[PDB]
Amino acid sequence: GLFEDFTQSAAQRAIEVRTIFHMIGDVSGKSVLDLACGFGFFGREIYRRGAAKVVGVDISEKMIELAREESRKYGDPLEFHVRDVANMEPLGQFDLVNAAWLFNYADSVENLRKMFKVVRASLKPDGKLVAYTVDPDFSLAKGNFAKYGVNVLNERAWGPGYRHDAEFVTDPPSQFSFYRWSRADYESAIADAGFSHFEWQKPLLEADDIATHPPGFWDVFQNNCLQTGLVCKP
Amino acid sequence: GLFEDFTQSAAQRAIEVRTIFHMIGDVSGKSVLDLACGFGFFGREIYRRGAAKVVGVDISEKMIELAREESRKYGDPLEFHVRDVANMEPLGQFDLVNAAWLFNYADSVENLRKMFKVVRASLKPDGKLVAYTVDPDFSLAKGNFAKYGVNVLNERAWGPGYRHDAEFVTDPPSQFSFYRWSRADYESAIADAGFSHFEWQKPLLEADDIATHPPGFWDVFQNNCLQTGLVCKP
């Protein structure tokens, strides 16, 4: 119902969700910490798919308030917390940490490295991190993402990474500003946090995605993707 | 190129744009004030379609500064201003005022009434207002707008109208809050601002929209539409 409807309302969201659940795998019985949980609706789908416990964290008070009200209305058992994730103490030892659109909101590599250490401090030794973030290789000169609902307005060298302002296709227009840290700096953060295993995951563009759009539609998505998945394990 | 791509990136945005240009008509040679201009990109399309002069206003100086930078990079002649529209002084006498997602951000009927008077004070006697706002008849219980990228979370009585919190389908999730004022409150605002003519305009859902989504996709859009157009003339 709701999760399908929202996931299909944007061509790229369907690819995002499919890629994140590919990385996650079977979540039956697992404890999950969703570190940039928004209003909780991804966490509610993880719960629906069989997770034993789902805890969501976000920076925004007013959004966590709204997340808790949604769980009361649905009767689901999700637990929420407001935290500045880069500086939070552990909430528990989870089988899975999910971090969609967390790491690109680290506004310095110092904060990026802190976030990865927070993830490790929240994971069982046989747990894993599944993340969705900006592909380090995206370059605005190679193509904007407006076909896919994100009008990237600029690209500013920002210390060792780049900062981007973007317009989303919302009514009214809305602004998001995010960071594109390098693959080197991600992998350094990963290793220094104690993840001896990682893999980058290309978004799973599939045959049906291509059939429902005109010729050339996904070219920039493939040649200059803005997004990437990432899986890390101790 | 960019306008087409971005407009088609969300099914509802295509219907909105079609409906707004239907209300506007031929803009050749006209002066246009876009009273909730975002980053200026609708204004840039109105300019491309032949407007003589396009001026944008919105509430966020961060957005307006980004709008100005986009005009410098594209070389277009758009001019922008940060204003609280309900309290602004006139910027000139225009042929057209466009107001997409302005009036549903008035947090009181007093502010709604003030906005309409500001529109009149900005219009030549033979000009017109084209607007896009929340349909007074929307009811959350009759269907959420999540298929169309807008998860309306709640509905509460708010003076003589209703207030809604909503989640947009963006990466990450984004929040915003808007107001659903009654048809009678709008019509009294229109008439007391000195508009002796108005018409409400249904969003133009067309055969090709219906054919390119699954069966039933547009049911809630047609039976419980969140959006309406509005045209007013002195």
Side-chain angles (χ1 to χ4, degrees):
Chain A
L2 182 65
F3 185 78
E4 290 179 335
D5 286 350
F6 212 54
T7 295
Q8 301 305 308
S9 63
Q12 107 273 343
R13 177 66 80 88
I15 295 167
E16 169 172 327
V17 169
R18 178 191 313 132
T19 308
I20 291 170
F21 275 121
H22 170 76
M23 293 188 283
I24 281 172
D26 192 345
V27 80
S28 305
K30 289 191 173 184
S31 50
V32 184
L33 172 62
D34 194 26
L35 277 182
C37 64
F39 303 90
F41 285 107
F42 194 79
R44 294 182 183 88
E45 179 65 11
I46 294 175
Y47 180 72
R48 191 187 71 76
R49 295 190 184 206
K53 188 185 188 179
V54 178
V55 173
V57 175
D58 210 277
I59 189 62
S60 173
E61 302 264 4
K62 170 80 193 289
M63 186 154 65
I64 292 296
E65 187 184 329
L66 285 170
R68 290 191 182 118
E69 170 64 11
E70 293 305 293
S71 282
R72 185 198 65 72
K73 291 190 294 202
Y74 291 120
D76 69 62
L78 274 56
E79 175 184 335
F80 293 99
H81 297 283
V82 179
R83 304 281 191 271
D84 171 14
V85 164
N87 296 301
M88 80 178 215
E89 309 284 325
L91 289 170
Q93 301 306 303
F94 294 80
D95 295 304
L96 167 71
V97 174
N98 186 61
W101 306 113
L102 176 69
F103 296 119
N104 65 312
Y105 286 92
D107 69 4
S108 67
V109 173
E110 284 189 55
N111 281 329
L112 182 66
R113 297 166 62 76
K114 290 202 274 197
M115 288 181 179
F116 272 98
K117 287 188 181 77
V118 169
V119 173
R120 178 72 192 90
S122 302
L123 273 172
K124 297 186 197 179
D126 54 356
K128 76 191 187 193
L129 164 71
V130 173
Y132 219 66
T133 193
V134 175
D135 188 338
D137 292 322
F138 173 84
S139 176
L140 184 54
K142 288 174 73 174
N144 196 353
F145 243 53
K147 275 186 177 63
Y148 321 111
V150 180
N151 173 24
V152 181
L153 304 167
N154 58 39
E155 175 176 278
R156 300 156 69 192
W158 206 262
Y162 300 81
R163 182 178 188 288
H164 297 280
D165 295 301
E167 167 184 21
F168 286 1
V169 65
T170 55
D171 300 311
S174 59
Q175 183 188 153
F176 278 82
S177 302
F178 56 91
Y179 297 86
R180 179 161 62 79
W181 305 115
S182 68
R183 195 169 312 276
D185 288 356
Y186 270 90
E187 293 175 1
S188 174
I190 287 167
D192 294 352
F195 297 104
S196 73
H197 304 297
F198 72 87
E199 71 177 45
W200 298 99
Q201 169 68 56
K202 197 174 269 282
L204 292 178
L205 178 68
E206 293 193 333
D208 288 326
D209 300 318
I210 296 172
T212 42
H213 288 82
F217 176 84
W218 294 104
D219 289 5
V220 167
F221 192 88
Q222 299 187 77
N223 285 333
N224 190 36
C225 198
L226 180 60
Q227 65 191 221
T228 184
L230 164 74
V231 181
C232 304
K233 295 180 182 181
Chain B
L2 173 76
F3 182 83
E4 299 169 44
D5 286 349
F6 204 56
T7 296
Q8 301 302 309
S9 72
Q12 75 279 359
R13 175 65 76 87
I15 292 173
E16 169 181 355
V17 166
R18 181 186 308 129
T19 306
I20 289 171
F21 278 118
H22 171 78
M23 296 188 282
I24 289 174
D26 189 357
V27 80
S28 295
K30 292 193 175 183
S31 49
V32 182
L33 175 64
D34 195 24
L35 272 185
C37 66
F39 302 87
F41 286 102
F42 188 73
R44 287 181 187 94
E45 179 62 13
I46 299 177
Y47 182 69
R48 190 191 69 78
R49 294 190 190 211
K53 187 177 188 189
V54 177
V55 175
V57 174
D58 215 313
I59 189 78
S60 164
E61 186 158 8
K62 199 168 52 178
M63 192 169 298
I64 285 301
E65 279 289 286
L66 281 168
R68 290 170 173 150
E69 178 52 28
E70 294 299 297
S71 282
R72 184 202 65 76
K73 290 183 303 193
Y74 287 117
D76 69 63
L78 270 67
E79 292 169 10
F80 293 96
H81 306 279
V82 185
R83 303 289 191 264
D84 170 16
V85 164
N87 291 292
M88 76 175 212
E89 295 304 318
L91 283 175
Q93 304 300 302
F94 292 79
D95 295 309
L96 170 67
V97 172
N98 184 66
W101 306 115
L102 174 71
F103 295 119
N104 64 313
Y105 288 91
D107 68 5
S108 69
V109 171
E110 176 178 9
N111 278 331
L112 179 71
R113 290 171 66 75
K114 281 166 90 163
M115 287 178 179
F116 273 95
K117 283 182 179 81
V118 162
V119 175
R120 181 68 192 87
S122 308
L123 269 177
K124 297 181 197 183
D126 61 347
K128 71 180 174 191
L129 167 63
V130 171
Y132 218 68
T133 193
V134 171
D135 185 336
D137 297 322
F138 175 81
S139 175
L140 181 53
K142 283 176 61 187
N144 196 359
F145 241 57
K147 272 184 181 70
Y148 325 116
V150 180
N151 183 19
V152 181
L153 299 175
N154 54 39
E155 177 176 274
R156 68 175 164 125
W158 189 256
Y162 298 92
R163 179 179 184 296
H164 298 284
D165 298 311
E167 165 183 20
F168 282 144
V169 68
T170 55
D171 299 318
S174 43
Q175 192 214 142
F176 65 113
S177 304
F178 61 90
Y179 304 94
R180 181 162 50 84
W181 302 113
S182 71
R183 195 169 310 275
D185 284 296
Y186 271 97
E187 286 170 10
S188 181
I190 292 165
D192 293 346
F195 296 102
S196 68
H197 310 285
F198 71 88
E199 80 173 78
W200 297 100
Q201 169 72 56
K202 187 183 193 92
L204 297 179
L205 177 68
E206 295 191 341
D208 283 354
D209 304 315
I210 290 159
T212 60
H213 294 271
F217 174 85
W218 296 104
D219 285 4
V220 171
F221 192 93
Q222 180 74 20
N223 301 144
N224 185 42
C225 201
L226 183 58
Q227 63 196 221
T228 187
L230 168 72
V231 179
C232 302
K233 297 192 183 168

